[PDB]
């Protein structure tokens, strides 16, 4: 497992503990739910590149405490 920090446009953070092999759709959906907006209204970036629903932390090279940025789609 690793902890990822999801940083919003307003500088707020929600952190997620996920498995290295987990498809990140679940993280996207949980974050959008907590922001009260549709998942498709947001885009989630790692090092500026879009995280797909079927990407895993392992595939993206993510490490403990790495940042995911959320932007409006």
């Amino acid at each position: 497992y690793i902890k990822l920090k999801v940083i919003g446009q307003d500088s707020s953070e929600i952190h997620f503990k996920v498995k290295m092999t987990t498809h990140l759709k679940k993280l996207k959906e949980s974050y959008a739910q907590r922001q009260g907006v549709p998942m498709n209204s947001l885009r989630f970036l790692f090092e500026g590149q879009r995280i797909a629903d079927n990407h895993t932390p392992k595939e993206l090279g993510m490490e403990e405490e790495d940042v995911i940025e959320v932007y409006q789609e």
């Binding site: 902890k3 707020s12 953070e13 929600i14 952190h15 997620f16 503990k17 996920v18 498995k19 987990t22 679940k26 993280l27 949980s30 907590r34």
Partner: peptide, 10 residues
């Protein structure tokens, strides 16, 4: 003010 820490397990 200052937000508390939020960690969600999936």
């Amino acid at each position: 003010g200052e937000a508390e820490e939020r960690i969600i397990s999936l």
